[PDB]
Amino acid sequence: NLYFQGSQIHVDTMKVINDPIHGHIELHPLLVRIIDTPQFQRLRYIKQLGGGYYVFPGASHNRFEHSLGVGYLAGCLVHALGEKQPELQISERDVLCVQIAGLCHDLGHGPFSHMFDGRFIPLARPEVKWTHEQGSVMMFEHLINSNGIKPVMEQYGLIPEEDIYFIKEQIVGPLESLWPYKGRPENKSFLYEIVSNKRNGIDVDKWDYFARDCHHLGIQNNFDYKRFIKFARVCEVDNELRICARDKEVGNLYDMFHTRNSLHRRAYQHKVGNIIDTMITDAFLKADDYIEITGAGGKKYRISTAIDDMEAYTKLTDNIFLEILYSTDPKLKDAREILKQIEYRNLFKYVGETQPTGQIKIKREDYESLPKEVASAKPKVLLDVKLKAEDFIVDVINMDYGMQEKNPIDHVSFYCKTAPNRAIRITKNQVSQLLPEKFAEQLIRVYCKKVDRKSLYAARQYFVQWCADRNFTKPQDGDVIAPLITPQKKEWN
Amino acid sequence: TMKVINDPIHGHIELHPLLVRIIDTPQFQRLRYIKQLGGGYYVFPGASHNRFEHSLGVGYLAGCLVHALGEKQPELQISERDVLCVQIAGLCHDLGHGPFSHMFDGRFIPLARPEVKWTHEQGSVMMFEHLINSNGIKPVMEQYGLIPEEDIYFIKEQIVGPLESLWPYKGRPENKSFLYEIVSNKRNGIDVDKWDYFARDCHHLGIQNNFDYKRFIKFARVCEVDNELRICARDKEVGNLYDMFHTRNSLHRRAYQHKVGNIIDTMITDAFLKADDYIEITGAGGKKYRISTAIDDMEAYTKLTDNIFLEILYSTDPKLKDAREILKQIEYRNLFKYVGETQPTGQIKIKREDYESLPKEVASAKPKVLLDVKLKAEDFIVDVINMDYGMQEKNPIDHVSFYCKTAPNRAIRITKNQVSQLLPEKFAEQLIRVYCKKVDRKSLYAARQYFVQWCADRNFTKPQDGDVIAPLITPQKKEWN
Amino acid sequence: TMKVINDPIHGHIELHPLLVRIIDTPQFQRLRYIKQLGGGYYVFPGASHNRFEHSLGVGYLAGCLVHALGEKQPELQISERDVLCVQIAGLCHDLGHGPFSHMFDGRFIPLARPEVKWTHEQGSVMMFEHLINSNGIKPVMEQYGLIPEEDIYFIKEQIVGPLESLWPYKGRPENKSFLYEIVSNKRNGIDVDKWDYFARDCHHLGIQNNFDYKRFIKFARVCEVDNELRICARDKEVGNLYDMFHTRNSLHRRAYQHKVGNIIDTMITDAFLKADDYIEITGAGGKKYRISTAIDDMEAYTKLTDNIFLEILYSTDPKLKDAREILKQIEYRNLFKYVGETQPTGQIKIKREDYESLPKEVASAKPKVLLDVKLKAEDFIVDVINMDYGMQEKNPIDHVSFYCKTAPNRAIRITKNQVSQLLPEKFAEQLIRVYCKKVDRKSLYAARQYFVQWCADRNFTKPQDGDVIAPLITPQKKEWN
Amino acid sequence: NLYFQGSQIHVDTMKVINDPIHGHIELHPLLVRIIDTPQFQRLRYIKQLGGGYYVFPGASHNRFEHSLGVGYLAGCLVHALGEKQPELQISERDVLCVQIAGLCHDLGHGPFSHMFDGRFIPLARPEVKWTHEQGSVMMFEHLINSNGIKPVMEQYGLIPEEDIYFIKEQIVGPLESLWPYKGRPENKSFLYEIVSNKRNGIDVDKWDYFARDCHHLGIQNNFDYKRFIKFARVCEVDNELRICARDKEVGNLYDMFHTRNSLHRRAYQHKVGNIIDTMITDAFLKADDYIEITGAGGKKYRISTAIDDMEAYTKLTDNIFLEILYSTDPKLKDAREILKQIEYRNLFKYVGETQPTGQIKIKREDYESLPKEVASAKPKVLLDVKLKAEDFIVDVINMDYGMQEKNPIDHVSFYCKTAPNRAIRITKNQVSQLLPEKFAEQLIRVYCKKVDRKSLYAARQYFVQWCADRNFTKPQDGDVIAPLITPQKKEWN
């Protein structure tokens, strides 16, 4: 009932949601429509850090709130780039599409997030190749079709067939195979760098999880994403328009990847968190033959096969832990007993950690053979117990800056104050001699399933002996856990 | 050996091995699967926190407060045994919570089993007993200087209050009265439970905490008050104490009684009610229990957590269709529609006996408006919320004792007018929310007319949006104009 | 080119080059040498923050609020020029503050020059004029679309209110009324100045902020209210608005009116008074001014900051001995002694005309106690503190307009009883603090007897520690017992 | 008036102070007595970060509040060590002494903290050798004697002559010259590691300033000192009792020194902060002949000579900046004009940054010769302006982990879970290949005092040419600021 320039004013109030990390943020009605579906709401029942909650009691946060944050930040970054550079022709349609991809990027996560595709599926179905990101595309497709989203998209200026395709590309990368993307052209290349940056890992996903995980873990975040946004521009790089950082921010960019690595070190790869994920996975494996999840047209699926049917997969969340824990079926006894051990805190025992020494790298094809190697070590110590291959767990952890051996800053372009449209490169030695010399390494953790004092003492001797035999690094507590073993190795002394 | 645990609220804290032994049981670990704020998570996406981490915090703060009091006043004879007992009570105070915390004993049980009288605190005693017995805790207690018979009893008293119908406690004597004020303070509500949840809930909700518990601890002493030794606050902290209860009230207002959070709890409860006949939880000796009867068997109750929401949601049993359909409406965000809020005006108070009759009153209002729809009693929900400073009509500060700088052993009282004229003049009130289960535009417009008419008829306060939602109704009431 | 600056409160914020040009002047940079909370730093060691950083924050938030309103409502015709003008007013609002901020115009000037009538806001207009003229800002303003004559006038109006004795503003018309509510809101006190100082002062003080300004911005709109376009709050935010003023009051209570902070301000002011005849500040054309007369010359006033405390402290001039000795007492922490606090009881209000006569009243009280010491009027300090919600006796929420979800263009009013019965029943009160300049045990004991006797005689409230500090006095008053 | 076991109870209420960093903390009356003196209160008028406030508007904090924090944390750490290990025989006297040293460690700072002893004194009086820590001893002595503290110390169980000596040793290190300390013996060696740790830099001073500076700067702290305290013990190391860290905290210790370095990088060595300190120092130098500070017995001192008289030095704070700024004396015109340039933000112009390349290190004896080298470079660029030695400032910044070239973790001892009384060493390669390979480097900043566009463009050409001539690293913006210069160097391309 109000008019301006002779035309009626229309008031479209956005939904406002209060997030502890980002504060009060506005959700466009199209995002709301996507959020309020069983497919998206599912993420409320999947813990961001999986078993981490069993080590960090503040880490009760789920994928849901993280996904909201990623959608929000994606919008924030695209908007800012567009406000500073109208010449990029960023439309509200483009903004929505990037927001949606941010929201939906984690739709394919299973129970306990990275445990599911990182540990469980590879063991439960070695023939398949599965990733949560592929799952996110399938789940996104299912969300769209089951909830009649296409008309709603059209209503807000989206072109579904193109934009749905674009969204999927933002999530999983190129869907085929020159410029490998179809949803958007080279001059909007920078749009593909926002949610999931496959080129250098600088994206808003990190920005949310740094801040969110820190808030819940009780570890403090030292990366400033708002600063980064202020010092980001889009410049021409080899015929694409790409996000570039202000040159003097290079220190802060190295620090961003240092933060990521510290979080993996302190929290995500916590030695006990990992053994809890291991044990949960063992329980799932022992339960997989007996639990039934009903999918499309009444078909029955297993935990390991629910990934093949999005209707079933929709019902596959952290709930499965409790279904197992609370079960009475005798056939689930073995699974159930593992989870009960978790509850009584009768966990597999951490033996130690070591690393390879040279340019030596442990191949994934050889992971399975490692426990046997440990059991076959011959420590010159008098022991009450003999341990077998099956008593040992050997967990190999790849720690890196997100691109294996590569320095991600070598794949970043910068701009200078005096020529803010000119992209440049900055090399490592131009920056600082105090930076890492390598960008990838492996940590090897060894655990023992025999938890008594005598078995643990024995396991330590086998472990350190194995380290010596393989020319691995001297464990940090080596002289304490295995004083009779460490002298033999003079490379260690 | 003790353990160090990192909590986001309290930082790195130490857990005595006896506490670890109690924590690492199915009975305690259960609290990982029960959301602190229940349906609140469906309005505040940061509110994913569970009772578990809150219980750790309460146990920690209980220890902190007892230790500080003991360090400053050796004459109180606070032993490490005393410290452990208070820590255990802090840890175990919430053991009796059910699915979605206060939804369970606040909404579900009263509807599902009106004959019984159940509280989470009673549940905590039963669950604590079950925890002790099922996990062989008594020997461990003895190993660390506790005397189980006495101390178990003491712990239960700290949780639920006096265990019988003059000093009413057996676990500890009058000269350690102050130990009963730490976990759950029945006298004035100043306890460490609040201190943890203020800070924790604020951290997760994205609302800032304005109470400083560490300051309070520095300005706390134990003084003689009528043959008891009681916690007393420094006199000049009286302002900050009023602010503590103001903070509590603001958190209820903004978050815990959020109009949508409450309707989600309502809907979840409806789903539980429609599921209760069909879900089976196996308890002691294979006996079968229902959601509503699991409170009678701690073995079954151990397996009754927020999981039940998802068991219902993921079920295929045709008998669970109705329950399942309510939860699906939650997921699609097809929620009951908020109509409005009002309050009583005078000394008038709505009795709980009459809550059930209210939707009928609303449906029977006769708005002088032409409507396309007629609504019935069953289309309305009337949610009556009691908001207070923790002791009904009473000012809790009237039950606080203070000490002065010049005589720190002398307990005194401070009255309200000695403090500030800007403080509340009353300490309890009721909020009345009305919702409609018919969600279409026409029904909602009708519901608004019935509601405002009802407010007028009952001499309740004018709804804030009254002139907008019911312009034809508001003029009739000149007390409103 | 614009600049990015990192503020701990607001993070990385952008400064338009015109704001930079204004910031980088001696007149603005001056604010780096004036503590926000004055003597507060001597009680709260984190409160080292200056007016400078606060002014940056206010300028930033002013821009934020105007921008948000404009983005949601293009029909308001908010221009970048308008944004700049509001930002400048935010930046420059505190230009007129003197040494130790509110101590200067609150305590010093009224004592040093009782004939004049001076406020920091008037000072800000004069200093703003001086800043513009001395730094050739007008051409720069023009370069960025401002119209100096009009916009300078507008800026001054935003700072000090209407510049004359019906729409009383010239800088902008009724349809941009809302622009005058942003920096300094004379109508209801809801402005961005509060928003910055809540957050900033809390950060430095070590007291937590419980107001959410970002939420407020999301629930703010501009609606027609009597031919003006005014900022309106969403109706359901009324609770949060009351809490905003509660927060203000708690900060005054805990920090800004801290009994020791105030006595430090008092003592500093005494030192300034004893120094005023002897310190020389060179102003325009070499003319000499005093601390008390520097307000008459902006060139001199530019050089009048917290530095004056240290000029006095470090001086050797025998004529400054008395001033210097007061500051040394501050350093040795030989402060005047706090005796107690009381309040008036009825509708009774202490007039400012009578403040000067109060120490004499205290000295003339006749306590029925045998004392070793007789105290005189000059041994007592009586500090009367007006505590209110910003508009004397008035409820500021009565001067707020709201909008409802179903009609977001329609401004409405909400009354107090429509909200909550737990809110204040009055919005102003007075606190009376009494101190003694005689610091020995015997004098202090005597002062307490005089004070409590005086409270009894005047029918003031019973001091909180009354029975402890003056046990022989309190029984006489049975209104107290 | 209350009794227990027949004896009167005495209630000694400590003063409580609210600090934003540490919260409500208790001050022992002896600390209060020391705090409430002109010598200590002086620290309220000296900014922690000096010129930093002119770049970071939140950095208004003074040495005073930092000193309170250090005193508090010193007490916290000593108390915790003593609570866990009664066998160390830590007394309340020991606690007080460490608290006092923490409080008083910064008493010797001058105007703008590190500017004074880092920049001003070395220029104003090159013959002398002065450090703030030496100043802190002298000021501490003056504080004690002028305020009659010795009797108060005795009253609380201190033995002044021994303990005063001990306090001074904690502040400045050994006062002479085997075990080089006299205040306490080898079995309380760990007490010397608390306030100022000369062996490996792990002390409570860092812990306070990390947290405090971060709070004011608007940069977030990522070090957790409370965690460290929980994982700290005292163990026998080469006949001393020394503070040892839990072995698995080694990652977090490396991160502690990384945090320190990031703070220097982002904030303390900010290129503009440093030029402001430079300019302030220039102003002091031009004022030094004309400002008079009255010391003991009416004697007159200068800014540069006030360090010789503690009574004068007591009156030498950040106030001197404003005395200069507000002065009218024609003789102070030149000083005053520099400060006015600061206020108008007419600052010397940043030209660029480079580093040495090899194991090459720029000697301090050669710093003075550098501007001349820059001015003598011969860029093959056509310029409107010729610049001289005096137009250039060359600021050489030593960035390191606190012990020059050394890895501080090589001077840390650790303990293991299974043997918490046994000290061990952990080497760099036992930890991680992603850590720094070097622990020290130099940054070379160049500035120009001629601020016009033409002079600045010229300065850039001289600078980059100089970098090329010296085989220094290619400036990050080199191709942008000096495109005609960079091609000549093929080591750069």
Ligand SMILES: O=c1ccn([C@H]2C[C@H](O)[C@@H](COP(=O)(O)OP(=O)(O)OP(=O)(O)O)O2)c(=O)[nH]1
């Ligand atoms: O005082 C409050 C009230 C709500 N919230 C949160 C809860 C939620 O995440 C967001 C939106 O809540 P609000 O109550 O504003 O939304 P609503 O219930 O959808 O209200 P309406 O639909 O009437 O606008 O703000 C707060 O942080 N503070």
Ligand SMILES: O=c1ccn([C@H]2C[C@H](O)[C@@H](COP(=O)(O)OP(=O)(O)OP(=O)(O)O)O2)c(=O)[nH]1
């Ligand atoms: O890593 C940093 C660097 C600077 N600052 C702060 C200091 C200041 O308040 C704001 C701007 O600093 P910056 O160094 O980006 O500005 P500049 O020195 O003016 O750089 P240039 O003029 O080269 O853009 O950011 C940070 O918070 N973090």
Ligand SMILES: O=c1ccn([C@H]2C[C@H](O)[C@@H](COP(=O)(O)OP(=O)(O)OP(=O)(O)O)O2)c(=O)[nH]1
């Ligand atoms: O509500 C308050 C009051 C004071 N303070 C701070 C100021 C100071 O840093 C510390 C101590 O202040 P308090 O008012 O308790 O001390 P006092 O004035 O010395 O009171 P008294 O001497 O009566 O104990 O607490 C707060 O943080 N909150």
Ligand SMILES: [Mg+2]
């Ligand atoms: Mg809503």
Ligand SMILES: [Mg+2]
């Ligand atoms: Mg462990």
Ligand SMILES: [Mg+2]
């Ligand atoms: Mg700059």
Ligand SMILES: [Mg+2]
């Ligand atoms: Mg005091």
